[PDB]
Amino acid sequence: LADADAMHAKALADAKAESEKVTEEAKQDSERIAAQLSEQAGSEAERIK
Amino acid sequence: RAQASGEVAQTLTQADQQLSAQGDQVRSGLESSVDGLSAKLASRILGVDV
């Protein structure tokens, strides 16, 4: 019972850690996608003028 | 995109106006040079000095 409680606490800590690893991946992604879409916007604006 | 298109359209309108004005301005000297051009063309299609 104590081992299972400790494993549950470790699982909650590991869930907090993947929430971190979801923020680290998702913020970096969102930033990169924003970068490529801004580059696409600039390229098409340059092409059009 | 929309700004690029709007800027392009505005510059197209301005350029149309400016280039039309420039063309009719230059057509004035065109009508001066037309006399010499036609004289030389006549002196060519005739094969001798006009």
Curated annotation (Swiss-Prot), chain A:
What other comment is given for this protein?
Binds 2-aminothiazole antibiotics, which are antitubercular agents.
This protein's name: ATP synthase subunit b-delta
> What top-level branch of life does the organism fall under?
Bacteria
Per the record, the coiled-coil ranges are none
The part of the entire sequence present here spans: 51 to 99 of 445
Its annotated function is as follows: F(1)F(0) ATP synthase produces ATP from ADP in the presence of a proton or sodium gradient. F-type ATPases consist of two structural domains, F(1) containing the extramembraneous catalytic core and F(0) containing the membrane proton channel, linked together by a central stalk and a peripheral stalk. During catalysis, ATP synthesis in the catalytic domain of F(1) is coupled via a rotary mechanism of the central stalk subunits to proton translocation. This fusion protein includes a component of the F(0) channel (subunit b) and of the F(1) subunit (subunit delta). Two copies of subunit b and one of delta together form the peripheral 'stator' stalk which links F(1) to F(0).
Task: Outline the subunit composition.
Answer: F-type ATPases have 2 components, F(1) - the catalytic core - and F(0) - the membrane proton channel. F(1) has five subunits: alpha(3), beta(3), gamma(1), delta(1), epsilon(1). F(0) has three main subunits: a(1), b(2) and c(10-14). The alpha and beta chains form an alternating ring which encloses part of the gamma chain. F(1) is attached to F(0) by a central stalk formed by the gamma and epsilon chains, while a peripheral stalk is formed by the delta and b chains.
Similarity-based family: In the N-terminal section; belongs to the ATPase B chain family.
Which compartments does it reside in? Cell membrane
Swiss-Prot record, chain B:
Taxonomically, which superkingdom?
Bacteria
The cellular location(s) given in this protein's UniProt record come to: Cell membrane
Q: Where is this region: Disordered?
A: 7-33
Which residue ranges have biased composition labelled Polar residues? Answer: 8-25
How is this protein organized at the quaternary level?
Answer: F-type ATPases have 2 components, F(1) - the catalytic core - and F(0) - the membrane proton channel. F(1) has five subunits: alpha(3), beta(3), gamma(1), delta(1), epsilon(1). F(0) has three main subunits: a(1), b(2) and c(10-14). The alpha and beta chains form an alternating ring which encloses part of the gamma chain. F(1) is attached to F(0) by a central stalk formed by the gamma and epsilon chains, while a peripheral stalk is formed by the delta and b chains.
Give a short account of what the protein does: F(1)F(0) ATP synthase produces ATP from ADP in the presence of a proton or sodium gradient. F-type ATPases consist of two structural domains, F(1) containing the extramembraneous catalytic core and F(0) containing the membrane proton channel, linked together by a central stalk and a peripheral stalk. During catalysis, ATP synthesis in the catalytic domain of F(1) is coupled via a rotary mechanism of the central stalk subunits to proton translocation. Component of the F(0) channel, it forms part of the peripheral stalk, linking F(1) to F(0).
Q: Give the UniProt family note.
A: Belongs to the ATPase B chain family.
- Protein name as annotated: ATP synthase subunit b
